[PDB]
């Protein structure tokens, strides 16, 4: 099995003990980590932050303590858009120009491979077309990585892309069999279900729907994302189910009406650390002394309140549960966002350190 684990190089920025770097990281703790994020500049691959040259040799330097594991180095992500990838797959020498530049790239800081995350093709501004072009990108991609290793000796470079758990924004932007022939794996955002963009509270990444919810909001859970990628063509042992290690929080209409689908007048109010309203990073989640914790039966994950704020997160408990389920479908593995999110330093939660990823790493 996989545990696929994201690193973030703007979490270096944040304050105090939540300030995470490369030597944060623990190098047995997952199978594959991932770098977010690189960005594009004239259809190649760049970086994003001034020390991001010597912060990717400490992040594969990890793998002269831990040989086994991979490294990928992922481009996109949700602030990024999509005009750059509309614009980078829209020509063939445009293609060429980038996929050259990741070759070179990735072996030059010794990356073992990339993880697309364009977010998303066939929306956000992108047209229908997009579908198309993703599906050409990912094989030219896949291609020329297949070349390379066979023209330089080394490891095969690998190919990964996360991808959205709404119906909408599969069907929009992905064949989902071709790109699965393709992708080495495919993490799965399988979070971000509900959140304070919304009226009622709901809980971030619950695995299952609630009695209560039906037609298109009957497939905003985990398991219903997992049964759309596999019976659209995803073998199982490429499908990674990708897990929060953050909540999304709520501020509540009454302190007196705190269950999950009550009135919410906003945005949780923002994480001291974390410092975006809307989310919560665990280690976050875990100072609300004196909060009321509460679990979403027919959604298998909990939820704390109090006073008018409600947050709606993963736990050990969650975590275990939904490895469970992954097992039972037979998937490749788990994915977790983000590294830097769980209680990293043992520093919140005296669970020790990473008590949410270890779980991962423990239960599969
Ligand atoms: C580089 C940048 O724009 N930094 C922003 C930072 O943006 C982040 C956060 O909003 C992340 N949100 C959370 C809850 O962590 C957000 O995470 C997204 C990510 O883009 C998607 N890609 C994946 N993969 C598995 C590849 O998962 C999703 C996650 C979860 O939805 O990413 C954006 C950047 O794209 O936000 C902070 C606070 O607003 C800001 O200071 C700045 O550092
Ligand atoms: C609260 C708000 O208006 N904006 C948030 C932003 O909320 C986004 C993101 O969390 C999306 N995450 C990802 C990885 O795309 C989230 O997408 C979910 C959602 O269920 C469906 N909506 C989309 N869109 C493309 C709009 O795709 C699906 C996926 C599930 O497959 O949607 C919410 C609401 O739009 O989150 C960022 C980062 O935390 C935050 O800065 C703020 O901009
Ligand atoms: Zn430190
Ligand atoms: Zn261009
Ligand atoms: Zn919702």
């Known amino acids: 099995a996989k545990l696929v684990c994201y690193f973030t190089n703007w979490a270096q920025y944040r304050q105090g003990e939540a300030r995470f770097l490369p030597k944060d990281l623990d190098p047995s703790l997952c199978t594959h980590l ?13 970086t994003t932050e001034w020390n991001d040259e010597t912060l990717y040799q400490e992040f594969n330097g ?25 614009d980078m797959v829209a020509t063939a020498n445009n293609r060429q120009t980038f996929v050259n530049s990741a070759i070179r790239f990735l072996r030059k800081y010794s990356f073992d491979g990339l993880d697309l995350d364009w977010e998303y093709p066939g929306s956000q501004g992108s047209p229908a077309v997009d579908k198309e072009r993703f599906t050409t990108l990912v094989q030219d991609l896949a291609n020329a990585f297949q070349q390379e290793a066979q023209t330089s000796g080394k490891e095969r470079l690998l190919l990964s892309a996360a991808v959205p758990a709404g119906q909408t924004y599969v069907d929009a932007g992905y064949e989902v069999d071709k790109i699965a022939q393709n992708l080495d794996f495919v993490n799965l955002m399988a979070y971000d279900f509900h959140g304070s963009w ?63 689908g009550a009135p919410a007048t906003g945005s949780g109010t923002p994480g001291p650390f974390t410092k975006e309203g809307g989310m919560l990073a665990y280690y976050e989640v875990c100072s609300w002394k004196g909060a009321t914790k509460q679990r979403i039966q027919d959604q298998k994950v ?7 704020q409600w947050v709606g997160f993963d736990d050990v408990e969650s975590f275990k549960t939904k490895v469970s389920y992954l097992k039972q479908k037979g998937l490749g593995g788990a994915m977790v966002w983000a590294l830097d999110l769980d209680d990293f330093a043992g520093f919140s939660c005296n669970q020790g350190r990473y008590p949410l990823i270890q779980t991962l790493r423990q239960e599969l």
């Open 302 to 308: 909990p939820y704390i309140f109090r006073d008018n």
């Open 62 to 86: 990890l793998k002269k303590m831990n040989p086994k594991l991979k490294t990928l180095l992922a481009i996109g992500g949700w602030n990024f858009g999509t005009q750059k990838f509309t």
């Open 34 to 46: 991932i770098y977010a994020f690189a960005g594009m500049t004239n259809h190649q691959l760049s």
């Open 198 to 260: 919304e009226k009622v509270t709901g809980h971030n990444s619950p695995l299952y729907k609630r009695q209560e919810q039906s037609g298109a909001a009957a497939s905003l859970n985990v398991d219903a994302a997992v049964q759309q990628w596999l019976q659209k063509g995803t073998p199982a042992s490429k499908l990674i189910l990708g897990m929060p290690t953050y909540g999304r929080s709520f501020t509540l209409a009454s302190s007196s009406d705190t269950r999950v």
